[PDB]
Design an enzyme around this catalytic site. Structure first.
Site, PDB file in Angstrom:
ATOM      1  N   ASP A   9       0.877  -1.165   0.000  1.00 52.47           N
ATOM      2  CA  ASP A   9       0.000   0.000   0.000  1.00 52.47           C
ATOM      3  C   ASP A   9       0.916   1.218   0.000  1.00 52.47           C
ATOM      4  OD1 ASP A   9       0.059  -1.052   3.055  1.00 52.47           O
ATOM      5  OD2 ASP A   9      -0.135   1.123   3.112  1.00 52.47           O
ATOM      6  N   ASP A  91      -9.615   3.734   6.005  1.00 54.50           N
ATOM      7  CA  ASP A  91      -8.497   3.775   6.944  1.00 54.50           C
ATOM      8  C   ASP A  91      -8.952   4.611   8.134  1.00 54.50           C
ATOM      9  OD1 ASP A  91      -6.210   4.382   8.427  1.00 54.50           O
ATOM     10  OD2 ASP A  91      -4.927   4.376   6.656  1.00 54.50           O
ATOM     11  N   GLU A  93      -8.015   5.476  11.800  1.00 55.98           N
ATOM     12  CA  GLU A  93      -6.995   5.397  12.835  1.00 55.98           C
ATOM     13  C   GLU A  93      -6.708   6.737  13.506  1.00 55.98           C
ATOM     14  OE1 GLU A  93      -2.850   5.417  11.317  1.00 55.98           O
ATOM     15  OE2 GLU A  93      -3.775   4.700   9.455  1.00 55.98           O
ATOM     16  N   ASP A 181       5.077  -0.252   3.384  1.00 58.64           N
ATOM     17  CA  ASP A 181       3.977  -1.066   3.888  1.00 58.64           C
ATOM     18  C   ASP A 181       3.872  -2.410   3.186  1.00 58.64           C
ATOM     19  OD1 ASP A 181       3.319   0.872   5.687  1.00 58.64           O
ATOM     20  OD2 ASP A 181       1.588   1.637   4.583  1.00 58.64           O
TER      21      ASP A 181
END
Ligand SMILES: C[N+](C)(C)CCO
Ligand SMILES: C[N+](C)(C)CCO
Length: 338
Positions: A9, A91, A93, A181
């Site tokens: 990613d 995503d 977070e 990643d």
């Protein structure tokens, strides 16, 4: 993608040239960052897309527990998807609200809009953050196996199952970020539907044969029926529980004639097959345990070593582990997690 497949990613942090890290990793599969909030667009998008084989795109959420804000972000994300892909990731977070149920709802509304737009929604995050700010279970109930969780451990750039995030519905595991990643797949992609076949299965004293729509039937050949492969006798019966050497490569046909892929227990020995069915030789690790498999001259051998503490113990097929570990330093072989 299939179980144990790898993917990378990326975002603007990776720059306009990711040919290098895709080579290092050994795959072109990528999930690229498209947007953040409702105003930011990753500038390297088109370049990163062009230089790889995207399997999805992700959005860095900033909506918190606000559902109306999640909708505006989902829409901004959607309006910028550059090409069709199976997945669109959420995503989540940062900036969680003090109200976990609200965080869950906004996340659900975001994922729902992705699903309504024709994609498979994915929830990406870290275990601890997810544990404190949302009810991931309420998410799995509406979107089964839709999790993509991060857990690095030592973050030395490799997959170490010892530090594998424990949670249900985990589809993908980002095992490191060291250089870049790194992610490994745990479940095959879905494919619900594709009903009916191009014929009818027939059973009898001698086994199973396949009557194609036009009356013919496969024999002395491989053939894909449904979503699986089979090999048929010169008489038209598909092989069962048997090894087959085809084109210098070994294949195993299971109880139901279905060609094996991934790990398969033959007798009391473990073997690992390609996504195309071919047996993989050498070192291959299934979760915490290591296996050294070989098939020279057709002699199928599976050398099993069970992990116990900081050591791996050889297990003679006589069902007994040695008293002391055979090795405390893992070999450099193929790592599999499912
Ligand atoms: C009939 N088989 C058991 C051979 C497999 C497909 O259903
Ligand atoms: C090539 N096989 C027929 C052996 C299976 C993978 O498609």
């Amino acid at each position: 993608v299939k179980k144990n497949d790898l993917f990378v990613d990326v975002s603007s942090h990776n720059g306009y040239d990711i040919t290098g890290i895709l080579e290092q990793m050994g795959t072109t599969n990528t999930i690229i960052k498209i947007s953040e909030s409702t105003t930011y667009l990753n500038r390297c998008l088109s370049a990163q897309v062009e230089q790889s084989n995207p399997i999805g795109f992700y959005h860095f959420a900033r909506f918190g527990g606000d559902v109306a804000e999640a909708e505006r972000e989902a829409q901004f994300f959607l309006d910028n998807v550059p090409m069709q892909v199976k997945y669109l990731v959420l995503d989540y977070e940062d900036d969680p609200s003090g109200d976990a149920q609200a965080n869950t709802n906004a996340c659900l509304r975001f994922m729902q809009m992705i699903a309504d737009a024709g994609y498979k929604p994915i929830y990406y995050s870290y275990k601890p953050f997810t544990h404190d700010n949302v009810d991931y279970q309420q998410i799995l109930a509406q979107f089964p196996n839709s999790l993509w969780i991060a857990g690095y451990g030592l973050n030395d750039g490799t997959a170490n199952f010892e530090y594998f995030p424990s949670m249900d519905g985990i589809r993908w595991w980002q095992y490191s970020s060291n250089p870049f990643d790194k992610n490994i797949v745990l479940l095959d992609d879905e494919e619900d539907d594709k009903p009916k076949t191009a014929g009818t299965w027939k059973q009898d004293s001698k086994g199973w044969w396949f009557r194609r729509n036009n009356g013919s039937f496969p024999y002395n050949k491989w053939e894909k029926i449904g979503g699986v492969w089979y090999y048929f006798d010169s008489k038209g019966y598909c092989l069962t529980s048997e090894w087959l050497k085809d084109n210098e490569k070994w294949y195993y046909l299971k109880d139901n004639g279905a060609m094996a892929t991934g790990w398969v227990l033959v007798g009391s020995e473990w073997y690992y097959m390609d996504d195309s069915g071919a047996m993989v030789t050498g070192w291959v690790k299934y979760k915490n345990n290591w296996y050294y498999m070989t098939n020279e001259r057709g002699n199928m051998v599976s050398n099993e070593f069970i992990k116990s503490g900081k050591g791996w113990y050889f297990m003679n097929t006589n069902g007994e582990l040695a008293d002391n570990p055979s090795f405390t330093k893992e070999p450099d072989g193929l790592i599999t997690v499912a």
